[PDB]
Symmetry: C2
Subunit: 241 residues, 2 copies
């Protein structure tokens, strides 16, 4: 069972052009993610999938592996499908190129889950959050069953707190592990009404009846999407030394 980690690292960003190359305590952001990905046990290869020559050269400069992909992909999932054709593996793990504080252990929990159940098509992560945090539309909530399979993902606070003291909330952490057959069939899946309304791509999988198991980990570090988050992560990564 061969697993590979793919890190989508597009150059562009509306608030932070050249995001993967931003310096964080002496190294470009993409290098931090790449180095942590290399510490994950059970992975055969780690690839940075980018759309810009500048990111590709930067990755090669530090000794990493990069693969050029199309600039017209709107989702990191479609970018992963392009890579699956070139890089053969049984399990593909998709890590965000803008989460330099990723814990290697969390990715191993995800991979273990896929290996423990060969019938599992997709796996992802989640962590507990307060009711106050669950009220925010920018935080994606997930509700799961006894086997930890996701019932639904939403920007609405679910479960609804009719009996507030009984509600427990989970935030979805956007890291995914996919079995190869899922990616081979991906392009044939139609967009779903819930996907379009919520603006959540993972709902395309659920619309088709593809199971997504969600493993719980401890609260994770923030991603870097705004210049404000960038300063926060820099300060956090600095004291972590």
């Amino acid at each position: 069972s061969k697993a590979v980690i793919v890190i989508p690292a597009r150059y562009g960003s509306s608030r932070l052009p050249g995001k993967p190359l931003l310096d964080i305590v002496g190294k470009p952001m993409i290098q931090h993610v790449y180095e942590r990905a290399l510490q994950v046990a059970g992975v055969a290869e780690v690839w940075v999938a980018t759309d810009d020559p500048r990111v590709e050269q930067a990755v090669q400069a530090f000794g990493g592996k990069a693969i050029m992909t199309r600039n017209d992909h709107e989702s990191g999932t479609d970018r992963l499908v392009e890579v699956m054709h070139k890089v053969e593996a049984d399990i593909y793990i998709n890590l965000q190129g803008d989460e330099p504080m990723i814990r290697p252990r969390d990715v191993e929990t995800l991979l273990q889950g896929m290996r423990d159940d060969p019938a599992l098509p997709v796996a992802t992560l989640c962590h507990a959050i307060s009711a106050a945090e669950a009220a925010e539309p920018s935080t994606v909530k997930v509700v799961v069953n006894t086997r930890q399979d996701a019932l639904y993902f939403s920007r609405s606070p679910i479960p609804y707190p009719r009996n507030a003291e009984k509600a427990r909330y989970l935030k979805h952490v956007g890291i995914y592990a996919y079995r190869r057959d899922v990616l081979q069939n991906y392009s044939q899946l139609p967009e779903s009404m819930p996907e379009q309304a919520e603006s959540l791509e993972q709902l395309r999988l659920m619309n088709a009846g593809i199971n997504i198991r969600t493993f719980e980990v401890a609260a994770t570090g923030p991603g870097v999407d705004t210049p404000a988050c960038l300063e926060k992560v820099r300060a956090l990564m600095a004291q972590e030394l």
Copy 2:
């Protein structure tokens, strides 16, 4: 495949004491439901499950079948489990005793769905609603996949309207069809956190991985809960008797 319809009809209610016995065009409410249930093709028997002798009596008075059940039942599904041990059937349909305007054709749609797929454990109904109606926590929303299987039921508006013009809402209609084996194994299922938080019994089934297929029908008639809507039903039911003359 024998199917039976069970109508839970408990007397005691806070804002409407003796609700199933209320008069609508000269008949108790429970009688209107019973009479519509009899019009459903493919159903072998129709029963009223109650915990009160006044209701049992009222039912027998018009010639319907009543079965006394325990009053200590926490959930309406637990009441159906007790009936299941005594009344044999392959498929049990649970109709609400307070929706006199139920359309027989909708129950037939539900029954046909169960017969067309032998592996389906539970089926229920839903109809389209506007975004404004979906905002009320007293209305239960459901989101479904391509096979019409329910993904989740919630008092929260789902799907969340991030791109508002693309959202389409479905209201859950509380009529269920259960395969016998689901009811036999029901009492062993533990209550789930989403069920307790939302106060939605159907989430207990979803917690255990039991599939619930949800069939879409046209907007239903106003169920009787409040006296402002009771007069709407009285007027609507009366306008219906004059229309079918």
